[model samples]
Target: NYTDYFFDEPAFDLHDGGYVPLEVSDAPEKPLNVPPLLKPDKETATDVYYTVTAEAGETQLLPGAKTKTWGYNTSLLGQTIVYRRGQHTHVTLKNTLPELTTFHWHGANVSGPYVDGGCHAPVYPGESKHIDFTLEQPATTLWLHAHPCPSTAEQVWHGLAAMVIVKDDHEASLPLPRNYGVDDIPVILQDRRFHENNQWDYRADYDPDGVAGPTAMINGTINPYFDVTTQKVRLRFLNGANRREWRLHFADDLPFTQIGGDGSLLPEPVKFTHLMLTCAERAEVIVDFGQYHEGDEVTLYTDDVPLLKFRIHAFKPDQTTLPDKLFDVKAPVVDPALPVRHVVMQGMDEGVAIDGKKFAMQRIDATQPIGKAQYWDVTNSNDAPGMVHPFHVHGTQFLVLSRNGHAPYPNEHGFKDTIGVNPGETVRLLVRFDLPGVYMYHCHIIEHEDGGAAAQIETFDP
Candidate 1:
């Protein structure tokens, strides 16, 4: 005799461009067990440096029980690494685990292939590697995770991901919440199924579509809750799951303002009562709890399952108004003479490929001129099961021009580095490279990416 607290909603399906109704969970709702937000140790100098080690240890996920897990710097998920935009950041990645792993920066624009920490860069067991790059992109939410070919999905499933925040002067000067873990917080959403003794068995739970767990965890904490001590709070939500798509909404359909997306801030805040986020995508929003007094609780959900709860408390008299403009994304028109490159993502499961061929480490699939604007028509071949492939590019961000000849979603009007391309749908993007290097573009689904649906483009000065 279980009660359903959250109702199910219809989800968009890409295969046939239809809607699929979700099933409500029958599990009884549990109390929110808040986890301590882990903020990284700050770098005190201009040329900042930090160290992260991928090691295995036991964490007490359940009461008085230890689960063997992998993490960066800590026993579970790593701490948040905060870097200011334009800062020269140096990080040392040590692989203390018994296997090889690569530290891939999911959203940072840097020199690729090697320093970008793609499949080509692998820090073997007991080996340490250093990567240096200046934050060239805007202030946005990025992340770091293991990207070893084939094993990426397994590694990430074992908790090898962390939040990385890139801050800039423009966002800092805005009249928004900036206090880390107080008003501005990072929410790493992931789902995991616990086995005997509260341990996760990635092999037993593996799926071709994408591995998913039955239970949700926010920042590695099961049944998590947060204390909202301010009138307004900014949540940087990162979809850290391997396959699960989070369809999030607040209790009572409360509206929240979306200020930023994957790569940069939107031109202005867009208010919405519901939003869906795919894997590896980030969404920044501000939720106002000003109307709530002490002891009021606000719960966040995915479908009918409650994920996080916010316990409101007394707040000071601070009324910060979001501006009409948040970013200047308009740039000079691209050269119309440049031909549009048609990229096709086809097949699925173990047969996935990009542009008709599987990914090869020694191959340079395409080439582009440095600092040249070009249009890319990326299409996901409408295969069976009608899965949506999230196309992601390294070393740069692009503007979404159109989707299937129609205008993009309202929230997609801003800059983006990754986008969801449905089956049989063509997504047009205006892509440009600021730095000359080899970069990887692929379906962001870890399984599809490592299976074969990945390619690389070499950028050179003309």
Candidate 2:
């Protein structure tokens, strides 16, 4: 029954110099580009190996000249990577791009500061690095992107973002859509501005708040549509945009059941006519189109512009049902003896900061013992008409306790590594790490994070 976007509409992308309004693309509708699954180099029962290369290439995005882009093992937006639980995964991060970049697993429980791939771990051009770890997290939609300090936004703008799915036995046991490409697919939401010759210019559209473009790009298609051959389809939506917060809805106000969030499946499925996703956040929803006929078309929109079109075809009716209990969070027991913490996010644009200071990779701001949970009060120090800051942490997922002493939004009752903090609000979160190392926490807005709106913490065993 949720219809509202649940965010401050006035502050939604109301940027001063670069609020580009999306226009209907004149290019003919093309089939949506689904990233192919990355093939593993080697695999045993307990370990897997993968080699990811960040290479510069060209992709046919618009009508004319190819846009120069960067991706992992592909031309643009890379390939979808899957990690199974209880398995040791080894990765060789290769950099073929002209510049240096770090590969960051956006929402997984891996040891940091190196294997987690934050600012301090950079894979320079013409070089490669090897890392390995065993995953303990549950099945969820995560992401990988360039995370090398102030240039993070620039790298991602050139196309370094891709989806990563963590799968487990329990989630695999669910009676959900597992068929890839046909029924289960990913929709990467992004926007870009085409310049002369149909290439992108980052500096020209750059703003301190956040760079924006007038064109909506789903997956990698300029104007995209999908062929629907199944009665029920699972759409994994990831906000791969640098700063935009997507307000998503269907043309007929059709309700969809949200089964998962950024880090794990929800304990209970929630229906929503409208869902909002900030940068780096993900939502998995099941859309049942039994009411529509084979010839009818259904359009998915963000705000007023159409984002994706569904061309229905004949198919058998689906009887797959979502279960009442999806995942047992089995949240780690918090020690009440731990001290409480407060993180301050102040200002806008270049004025933004985690705690009155810019980010320094050489400095570690906080420290805690591994497996010790604490109440962190994440405050957004903006008044009314201020932008919502989506806070994100590396290496661990957290639980939202409350917002200004009130219940969190209905869709937040799940394991999450990112949460949106509205202006003038304080969100209480319970966060802990199972492994010991340094990790970063900052705004999901790439520009804001690059401009020093970030901090890092170290977890160690005494």
Candidate 3:
């Protein structure tokens, strides 16, 4: 068993919405410089081993003094998994903790139900499994985590997840922020519970829709800050929360341009002040804070609390304007020749199951032939009832085929792995399984996810 980081005080209550105001006196003395990339460039050549551990540690929050937890490289959340596209990305996952665990590559097209490794493949304590695969998809935001059935929400709460960035030469050629921690930044927004025992807890005292944490944690840190040196800074924001969707916007309502979505770059930059991030979605944005004086600092706040404090310093002007066309978006329409699969989401409590059965990670409840295009009609029976469930599909990028014969919102365009299904409404999507891999699809609501509201799909060539 590994040890966790120490905290400053005992556990306490955080207000609703996980909002905590940060005072200048309460800020850290040293600059919270979380390098854009947790790890330097990993030239994919040999297999890499990852160790998952559960222990007690402390973060900025008071309740972090002790608790049950999991992490990849460091406690809290692990290091960032950074790699370029077209590289032979290989990994060896080692589990040394006291729980049964399995690795799930959130959004990649790789091997089959065997190596595609969902909740079905468990590696016991002190067990090691070597994985080898080559990434063939375009550059996008992906992730890895322990996906054991009935315990995914538990393990993820213990900090068993991290980010993966696949880069191709085409994307590298762009004049974007390439510096891992310096110019480019990864903002993982999440909310966690700070229990009375000076530790973190997700279940036992939360809702079945998914537990909503009282404390907001950004990149595993509470109320962190970053110093800005360039006129323009690129922020890669990942909605790493288990249940709650982050309604993100800049303080003072500053305008930010979105360059990319989940799987690829947007057709054009969409400037907005309010953005929504369901579970497992990534948004790349650029902000210009250099217009202020050198000593002036701008608070990069969210919902109220200061997320990342940006201090304006000396920097050259960023003269580069956003390009008109960011990338090519290809989404085919749903054809009438093939059968459409409908996923009915209904249930009052945690007993609600996809199709009729509860979430079974190892059981590839749905199967599709490799290199085939199909339509999935994800209908929410609760839509007409109350609330909305944002549906998420793993494996490939999908187009919003139709939502009641009308297109979705402005942000719903392009390729999407997650979409908000309104109450009583049916959302139809056109998806093509381009890669032979096994992936999990489920309700992004953190509480709902842990409540058996998930399904798994495996794709293999005919």
Candidate 4:
């Protein structure tokens, strides 16, 4: 027996002025697009250097014409980058687009504000900026995307996101699938709308609530399929949509074990037949297809339409059962003197805001001391029937204490940088910063964060 969601489902699929239901495209199935690993510019024993440019290109998404898209190094859905833990890394942020953009590491732990690539940092057209940091977090899947306030949604819609995996010695020692592109695969979930001449018109399909299209673009491929040749396969799924929340399941009712979440692996594996992901949240799951024989087919779906297909081929049998414990969460003890901070997310579309006010570029809404933990009550002020805002924070991965004073989701025992705050519900989080800088906290719905639902907090030396 597998598990289902505790939170209400189906109601959150499509809403607002007019909803666009998902449609399975008739385009002929193609090989699943796996993002190529990025090659570093320079690598020494202690330091690594690389370049990430926000540029434009053309991609053949459909049959007839190519779609004019934007990306980091490639045309769409930039190259996959692997960062070794404890190594000092330097990245050159370049901008070749007509306007300005910022390289925001979605789950990276950096001394932030500028290095965090928040609104404060901007790499203008024909310009470049450099930032360096040593990775200190556990091994997990993160992402690099554009984050420049009001225009974030439009920029991301232009294909400005990439997969980033952090590696460490501890996670490497585990008996898990370690092969890349074959056994360990990346499944980036996103959607898009096509226009005349096979191009994207962000403004034409704009929605203040959140923009979504009918077509499901997995790893930048339409109707993608992968050949399964092994007994065990690990799929790294990241919801890279602007506002859409993905409710994923195997059409064959295949049970997969979820081993990790947004920033780290869970304390233990959780078996599930259904998993839901808001924008920017990631899940690392393993699917064992040993029971199925050659020539069998498995499909992944949301509601009824299929997204990706897995065709069974010859494979090597690996019967190694996963360990009971997958990760060890080290949460810092909170100082008794600190009070529980309150952050309220409210409204819809243009009325969206934090603490009843829109985000200000120069304002530091709150402050905390480094090295001490603080409990934050993040509440969604919308009614029960309102939108479920995905609350995300920059610069630190936090631990979920409770949701409305109750236990969080079963797979939420690990570190997470984002949480989907249900309407009229308050989710408490324990965040402790290791560096002194500024960090942005806001709704993960691209349009809402761009419209107004965001604020910044400062961490200073005690």
- Encode model 4's per-residue lDDT on 310-424: one tens digit a residue: 9999898895788999888988898889999999998987899999899998899999998888999999898756877889999889999999999999988899999988878
TM-score of each: 0.91, 0.98, 0.86, 0.98
> Which of 2 and 3 is ahead in lDDT?
2
The alpha-carbon deviation from the true structure for residue 459 of candidate 1, after best TM-score superposition, in angstroms, is 1.3
Angstrom error of the Cα, residue 341, model 4: value is: 0.6
What are the clash counts of all predictions, listed in order? 1, 0, 20, 0
The global C-alpha lDDT for each of the candidates, from Candidate 1 onward, is 0.81, 0.89, 0.68, 0.89
Ordering by lDDT: 4, 2, 1, 3
What tens-digit string does per-residue lDDT give for candidate 3 at 1-462? 421111101111122234233332332434563623444333424433333333334444442344555677566666777655556665667776778787777766666454566655788887778777777777777777777766777787888777777777767767777677777878888777665765765555466755656566777776677888888888888877766656666677777788877777777788877676667778888887755778887776654556667777888887667777777776554445668888887764566567887776446788877566788888777622345567877667787767867766555566777777765668888788777677777887656767888887877777
- For residues 265-375, could you state the per-residue lDDT of candidate 1 as single tens digits? 998888888887878889999999878899999999877778888998899967799888888887546768789999999886778889899988889999998788899
Q: After superposition, how far is residue 282 of candidate 3 from its true place, in Å?
A: 1.4
Best of the two (1, 2) by lDDT: 2
* Candidate 2 wrongly placed segments (more than 4 Å): 1-3, 15-18
How many Å off is the CA of 290 in candidate 3?
Answer: 4.0
Off by over 4 Å in 1: 1-45, 383-385
TM-score of 3: 0.86
